[PDB]
Amino acid sequence: DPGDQICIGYHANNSTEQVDTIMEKNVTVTHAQDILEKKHNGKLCDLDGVKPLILRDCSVAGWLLGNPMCDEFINVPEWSYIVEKANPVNDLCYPGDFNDYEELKHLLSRINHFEKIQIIPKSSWSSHEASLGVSSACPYQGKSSFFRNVVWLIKKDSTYPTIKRSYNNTNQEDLLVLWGIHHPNDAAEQTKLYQNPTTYISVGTSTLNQRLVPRIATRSKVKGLSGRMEFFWTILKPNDAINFESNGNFIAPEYAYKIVKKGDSTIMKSELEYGNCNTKCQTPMGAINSSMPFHNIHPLTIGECPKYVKSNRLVLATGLRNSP
Amino acid sequence: DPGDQICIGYHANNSTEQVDTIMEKNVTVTHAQDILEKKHNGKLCDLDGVKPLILRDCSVAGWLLGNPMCDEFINVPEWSYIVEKANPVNDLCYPGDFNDYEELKHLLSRINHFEKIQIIPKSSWSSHEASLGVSSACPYQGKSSFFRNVVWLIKKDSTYPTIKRSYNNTNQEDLLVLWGIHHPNDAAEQTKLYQNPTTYISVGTSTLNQRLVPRIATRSKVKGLSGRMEFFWTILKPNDAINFESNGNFIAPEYAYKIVKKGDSTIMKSELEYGNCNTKCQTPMGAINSSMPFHNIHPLTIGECPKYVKSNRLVLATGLRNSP
Amino acid sequence: DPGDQICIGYHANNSTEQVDTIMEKNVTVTHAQDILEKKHNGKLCDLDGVKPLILRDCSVAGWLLGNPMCDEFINVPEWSYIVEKANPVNDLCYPGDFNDYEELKHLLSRINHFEKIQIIPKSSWSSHEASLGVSSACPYQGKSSFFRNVVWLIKKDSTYPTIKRSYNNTNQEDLLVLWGIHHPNDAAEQTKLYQNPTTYISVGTSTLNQRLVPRIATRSKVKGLSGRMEFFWTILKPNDAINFESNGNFIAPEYAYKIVKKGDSTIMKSELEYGNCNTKCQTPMGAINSSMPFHNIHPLTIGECPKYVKSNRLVLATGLRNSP
Amino acid sequence: GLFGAIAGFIEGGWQGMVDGWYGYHHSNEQGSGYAADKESTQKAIDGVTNKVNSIIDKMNTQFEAVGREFNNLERRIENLNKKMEDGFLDVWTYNAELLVLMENERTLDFHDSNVKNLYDKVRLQLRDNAKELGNGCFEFYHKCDNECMESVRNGTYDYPQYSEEARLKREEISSGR
Amino acid sequence: GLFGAIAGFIEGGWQGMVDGWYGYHHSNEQGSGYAADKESTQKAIDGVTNKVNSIIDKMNTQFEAVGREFNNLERRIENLNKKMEDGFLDVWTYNAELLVLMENERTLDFHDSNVKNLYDKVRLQLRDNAKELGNGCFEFYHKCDNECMESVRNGTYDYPQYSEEARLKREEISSGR
Amino acid sequence: GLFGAIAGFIEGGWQGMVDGWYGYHHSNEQGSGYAADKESTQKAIDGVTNKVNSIIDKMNTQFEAVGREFNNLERRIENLNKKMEDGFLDVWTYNAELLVLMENERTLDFHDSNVKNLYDKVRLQLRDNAKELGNGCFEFYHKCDNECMESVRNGTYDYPQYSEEARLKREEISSGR
């Protein structure tokens, strides 16, 4: 006969969730809690409202300077973040250099919008040749062409008279301005193109004090050309003026850029293209939509994101150990 | 009937100290120990013995070069650390540029004392004009003036014969030497001030090899001026000689500085002024007087300090859990 | 009378291992396990197979330009890692500067082998004097000499006709190339050595655009000389050509380096010399041979090594507490 | 576990207790059933919810990698930059995995220590009015109906009230009939 | 707590025991009073003092922030600099906050493990010479004066000495008068 | 330790059990000896070997110092460089030392919780067929030979089988004669 009885016990169920512990692996428990998000959508999205700027086969240098093949980007909307491929094809079509280029890219990461403006009219070049400045390295569609936002001045009749030109930033916002110099192959090329054999380019700001000189040298052919173009850039402060003077080898500007909205942004390296979707979190490998505190997709993320960790697994134990 | 009794128990009292634990917040306990020092005295103090060098409305550049408004600092005492405001007013009074100025500031964090010494006497300028080098940008008090430690030479009668001047560091300590170049606005100005149109500044050391040339351009007005001054500096090793040769556009030295005691120091960015106290621990927000292992005032501290953390609260539980 | 008995107890022995705990230090336990390696062998060893390049009293610069005092290194075998002393004696024997030298040292850390090749034959200088180009700064054995991989051209008869030389890298690997410019003391020196008073050195690549000019100045004597040498470098891409044009003050190349095995390597600062041994782990203090997960010899190690920590003791408690 | 209760002296957990983590299974004259302990199940939910939020919240601010780009002659600081963001990514990976690992063990001994502590809540209430079997069960020396079983659950169990009937049935079993 | 003593089987602590953390409250014919256990209170002090010093001592050296200045076109590496010094400030803030939290738990359950363990030093000394009341107190089966109470305190308690008078008092209450 | 067994109620360990960490000492008419508890000694070996591998394994990836050389006017990032590599060297040293220390405590209280758990395994098997002495040993109320000692060791021990001989021997000592 059983006299009255009472027992104490604990919960169990059908759960095969396994956690780990410092001393024991794959411990099966009643309840678990995963805290790591591992799946994304392989696509580049809008970020809340805004569609990212995706340069396709373009580089940042190629966009701003105005590569013929980059015309798709002549007047971009305000963006949420820029996307650039790892080694874009359309960079500096005419071979040379973009000075302090990495730093310039740096600014872009805090800029959401430009507004292209003309600051020296191409038509204003009355005593020089705006329209001979054209190269085979710089092809529109078989038509050999040039960058669009600058202008390659050339001697008219036989001579190249001294340029003195200026623009005063009367806007309330800052002005990104670009220009450049052309380095010929020998004395002969120099004198054919600009007549004057000894030349210079002076550029002044409230802070700029630059005087450039062409640098004649015998060089390798790049894209069939031996000469070089070297481009330079500055920020022109509100209510400050910029002044050019030259004498040859001048790559003059026509258009400038007003920094018109600043904010969070990144230059995001990614091969991807536009995914026609939308998130609150974007990764160069795909967007994440998750409540988790942690993800393991890619450490360079933008937007309202979980914190990157390198784990394959992050799972917490909440319930108790389940029966053998 | 009560048979004899013995009971086991623990301490309790009327302490309302609360600590926290991974699972439980605001647990009331018997004894606690705060380890976060949270209060400072809002003042800039001496450090043990020594009064900091406090530039008021000066920058380091304005001090070392001799901006007339910075005369308060013509001959400083030895310091423990320099305090500079975020945006000093008296920097370079005549507009221009200071080369590698940031790296030079970096040296100062390990220097506690200079000794201004004359290395080329203002009176020695026998065949040039030492005393016309004065600007409306560089006001003593309405009297237009110049930087004090350098000299802006000018043509005398009509000419400026070639300068060849040298100074040999016969001291046992290191010599900080400063100089500069004047960039005029046009050919007309160049020849008015210095006569010669084509000019240069050479500066040679056992390790320097510099030939600077003035760089003409048309620029914005800054403080009513369009011209620019660009300044340069070297350390002259003991037993070494420095030699200047120039021809125009030279801003010559008069005083140099011997590096005379090195040691711990910092440049402290702070708005504060002299607080007339003393501590063993200083912060740009105020001094700390404490035994705590941790503080949360400001990460940039100098002197014998507790270790910085960003916590609002750090309390250890030492006693036992307290009665309901 | 004793009724039958059963007892429960735990292990003990003759162990004097002590561990520490958050609350108790030097607790003697039954079994412990040290995880910190503290001993090394004080020698510089081979790395598996490979003997390191040990420059003795040479620097990376002295080696590559070929200081006469460095001849021990005229044609080295492949290495595992370079060892350079902290303040090498045989650097640039004729005083001057080696441009972007730290960045070059950086390239060396991923290079395991060079192959010196001739790119401009010393005999080829038919209309100049290759063989006068020698200095007492640069002594072979009391014989005054020069760097070996470069050539100091000098005027022949009375004149120095314009040099035009180019070399096209037809190998499948990259070419490290070096050259340099000589800066005299005065006009008199310049015209004695090179005849032409106004001179230049132009240098072109698919990526280079360089025009160097000598900088006449009066300077401190270094090693009894007042003049200076300034050296420069480039990687010459496969199938690309380099072109030199000059007019005076040219230090031409003769020999170059083909980058011919890349991989892991480092530049190790160490005073030591070749120890005639072998490891799988090398330290600038001596080699390690150990199974331990941790060591504290030196933070900069090369090869399959335990992880550095700064502790003087890391001992685990594995066994149980030993009798009070 | 550290306290010897879960997977210890109570071998097996009850598939049938579906409304709490810890509880009771009585068996008297009227029959049997399951009833879960009211405070300890709640004492554990609070302890677990506070810990889960404490871990998530501690890691709320943590290093965030930023893109920086450097050119062909910035090789060094290019490399400096890389090792730095990598370094930090590794520290936080380690700080995270190790926190879970550690608080998982401690999560289990909270559950274990709670079971063993509830068994001793009953053991010092009944004392010698019931027999400790050693399998985690108590067998009464007196008669206990359904409002009496309830008094053991909520802590109301009256000892002097039943100590008379129990000490008389202890006398019956001492003789062996 | 983990061991079920503090806020457990001893519900409430004694406002009046001022000279220690843990102790005794005796009650014989001569009267009543408080007596603190000198060795367990002293061993807990050493354990807490070592912990407070280990914590301050581990944060011995930890990152110290430094001022550096960069110019207008050193923006890039300027940022590298901020994110690094911020990064490290964050690592050490997390390390300080989390070490306290963790070692606060282990401090309370050390006090908890100690109280319950002093109760078991006494329970395993008396055995059946006293009755476990369950409220953390013992009721003796024999007469115990002040020189006898002290022998339980310092660990001297003699079982066979009192076991005869005790086994006769257990037998008398077995009878029920 | 936290569980009061090691250096507690079993004061001192047995020099003679050279074949295990925890175990038994039987003592009947046939003689006496040491017998190591076979299963729990293995249960502790696995928890410790897994712990040791997990500590080494967690420090799997950890900051690796790299050589960088900077020139004379690169003083700033030269310094940036240094404070960084040091910065990290410190973080990982703190992490290694503080981890060893923490898991040293937890290693000991595992051994402690285990002894106290093997003693309560035996205690709830025997119950009143033996007398709890308080020094960690059990004295039987019946006759127990070597195959009976084995039934307690491997967990086979039968209570109802010896319970009659025990309750009649308990009855003899109640009377005194």
Ligand SMILES: *[C@@H]1O[C@H](CO)[C@@H](O[C@@H]2O[C@H](CO)[C@@H](O[C@@H]3O[C@H](CO)[C@@H](O)[C@H](O)[C@@H]3O)[C@H](O)[C@H]2NC(C)=O)[C@H](O)[C@H]1NC(C)=O
């Ligand atoms: C670029 O053009 C802008 C046009 O907005 C010019 O800025 C203006 O500069 C004039 C000076 O020529 C300033 O006029 C002055 O007014 C102030 C009081 O506001 C007074 O102190 C003076 O006596 C003078 O008459 C005016 O402030 C300023 N405009 C604004 C909106 O601030 C400027 O001339 C050009 N900038 C450069 C750098 O060339």
Ligand SMILES: *[C@@H]1O[C@H](CO)[C@@H](O[C@@H]2O[C@H](CO)[C@@H](O[C@@H]3O[C@H](CO)[C@@H](O)[C@H](O)[C@@H]3O)[C@H](O)[C@H]2NC(C)=O)[C@H](O)[C@H]1NC(C)=O
């Ligand atoms: C700047 O002035 C310093 C200090 O007076 C000068 O240094 C001295 O230079 C003379 C040579 O002009 C050295 O005399 C020599 O002694 C060496 C060995 O010491 C001996 O080998 C030679 O025969 C020679 O006569 C003297 O040592 C040296 N003084 C010191 C303290 O080193 C020097 O002329 C100037 N330095 C520069 C870079 O212009």
Ligand SMILES: *[C@@H]1O[C@H](CO)[C@@H](O[C@@H]2O[C@H](CO)[C@@H](O[C@@H]3O[C@H](CO)[C@@H](O)[C@H](O)[C@@H]3O)[C@H](O)[C@H]2NC(C)=O)[C@H](O)[C@H]1NC(C)=O
């Ligand atoms: C340095 O020497 C290299 C190696 O010989 C030269 O590279 C070669 O250049 C020739 C042009 O003269 C290339 O010929 C071309 O062939 C391709 C297809 O084979 C075709 O697209 C062209 O119409 C042309 O006929 C040849 O491809 C190229 N060799 C390699 C391996 O790419 C080069 O001429 C020299 N470099 C310089 C800068 O002078």
Ligand SMILES: *[C@@H]1O[C@H](CO)[C@@H](O[C@@H]2O[C@H](CO)[C@@H](O)[C@H](O)[C@H]2NC(C)=O)[C@H](O)[C@H]1NC(C)=O
């Ligand atoms: C923990 O459980 C997992 C799940 O099986 C095991 O991890 C690996 O799992 C893969 C599939 O995901 C299996 O093919 C293997 O059994 C495992 N691989 C390795 C290399 O072990 C793992 O075995 C379990 N760990 C322990 C200690 O039991």
Ligand SMILES: *[C@@H]1O[C@H](CO)[C@@H](O[C@@H]2O[C@H](CO)[C@@H](O)[C@H](O)[C@H]2NC(C)=O)[C@H](O)[C@H]1NC(C)=O
């Ligand atoms: C922790 O205890 C304090 C005791 O007041 C509480 O902290 C906060 O501060 C005010 C006054 O100091 C309290 O009245 C509020 O309840 C708290 N503010 C907020 C915004 O929560 C707090 O009650 C306790 N913490 C929790 C989580 O309850």
Ligand SMILES: *[C@@H]1O[C@H](CO)[C@@H](O[C@@H]2O[C@H](CO)[C@@H](O)[C@H](O)[C@H]2NC(C)=O)[C@H](O)[C@H]1NC(C)=O
């Ligand atoms: C730990 O054990 C050693 C025993 O010598 C002690 O550690 C230190 O070592 C020196 C000699 O090696 C001892 O004389 C000192 O006591 C210690 N040195 C210093 C600088 O403190 C130490 O006594 C023991 N530690 C503790 C906490 O007892």
